[PDB]
Design an enzyme around this catalytic site. Structure first.
Site, PDB file in Angstrom:
ATOM      1  N   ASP A   1     -15.879  -3.933   9.226  1.00  0.00           N
ATOM      2  CA  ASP A   1     -17.093  -3.356   8.654  1.00  0.00           C
ATOM      3  C   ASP A   1     -17.874  -4.283   7.718  1.00  0.00           C
ATOM      4  O   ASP A   1     -18.810  -3.801   7.049  1.00  0.00           O
ATOM      5  CB  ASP A   1     -16.776  -2.052   7.887  1.00  0.00           C
ATOM      6  CG  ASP A   1     -16.194  -2.292   6.480  1.00  0.00           C
ATOM      7  OD1 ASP A   1     -15.957  -3.455   6.073  1.00  0.00           O
ATOM      8  OD2 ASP A   1     -15.960  -1.306   5.761  1.00  0.00           O
TER       9      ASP A   1
ATOM     10  N   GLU B   1       0.810  -1.198   0.000  1.00  0.00           N
ATOM     11  CA  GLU B   1       0.000   0.000   0.000  1.00  0.00           C
ATOM     12  C   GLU B   1       0.853   1.261   0.000  1.00  0.00           C
ATOM     13  O   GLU B   1       0.593   2.175  -0.791  1.00  0.00           O
ATOM     14  CB  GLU B   1      -0.958   0.004   1.191  1.00  0.00           C
ATOM     15  CG  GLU B   1      -2.099  -1.017   1.127  1.00  0.00           C
ATOM     16  CD  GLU B   1      -3.147  -0.704   0.076  1.00  0.00           C
ATOM     17  OE1 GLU B   1      -2.928   0.241  -0.701  1.00  0.00           O
ATOM     18  OE2 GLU B   1      -4.147  -1.428  -0.004  1.00  0.00           O
TER      19      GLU B   1
ATOM     20  N   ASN C   1      -8.912   5.541   2.838  1.00  0.00           N
ATOM     21  CA  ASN C   1      -9.649   6.299   1.814  1.00  0.00           C
ATOM     22  C   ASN C   1     -10.442   7.466   2.366  1.00  0.00           C
ATOM     23  O   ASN C   1     -11.159   7.282   3.344  1.00  0.00           O
ATOM     24  CB  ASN C   1     -10.647   5.323   1.140  1.00  0.00           C
ATOM     25  CG  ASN C   1     -11.022   5.748  -0.253  1.00  0.00           C
ATOM     26  OD1 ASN C   1     -10.711   6.831  -0.635  1.00  0.00           O
ATOM     27  ND2 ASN C   1     -11.696   4.886  -1.013  1.00  0.00           N
TER      28      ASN C   1
END
Length: 129
Positions: free
Chosen positions: A101, A35, A59
């Site tokens: 999530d 990343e 994000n």
């Protein structure tokens, strides 16, 4: 800050990511590598106009406010710049929420295309932990 591999592993473990929602520490280190290359200051723009910030490329579309991603959310209630700090606390705490999530680590496309299904343990080999 650019972390060392084992330095990041340790910081990540100290903050409770080792087996968090069952993702072993190697998964986190592998994700951070691909990343950001372990660089807390990494930023990359997404096609939708959002931007990814910090060591786990979190994000602005959902998780933080960068003052320029219209029609977005800030589910970690933080400015996106907090994710670029040499201290990874806000990244890790936000990561815990992202991974919880529903989609697990699949929320990180680099994890999914480069870490999932691989020998992630290699990422924490040689490290004193």
């Amino acid at each position: 800050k650019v972390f060392g591999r084992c330095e990041l592993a340790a910081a990540m473990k100290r903050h409770g990511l080792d087996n968090y929602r069952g993702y072993s520490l190697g998964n986190w280190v592998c994700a951070a590598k691909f990343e950001s290359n372990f660089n807390t200051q990494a930023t990359n723009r997404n096609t939708d106009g959002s931007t990814d910030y910090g060591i786990l490329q979190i994000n602005s579309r959902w998780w933080c406010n960068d003052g320029r991603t219209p029609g977005s959310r800030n589910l970690c209630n933080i400015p996106c710049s907090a994710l670029l700090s040499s201290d990874i606390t806000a990244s890790v705490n936000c990561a815990k929420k992202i991974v919880s999530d529903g989609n697990g680590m699949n929320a990180w496309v680099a994890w999914r295309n480069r870490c999932k299904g691989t020998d992630v343990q290699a990422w924490i080999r040689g490290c004193r932990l």
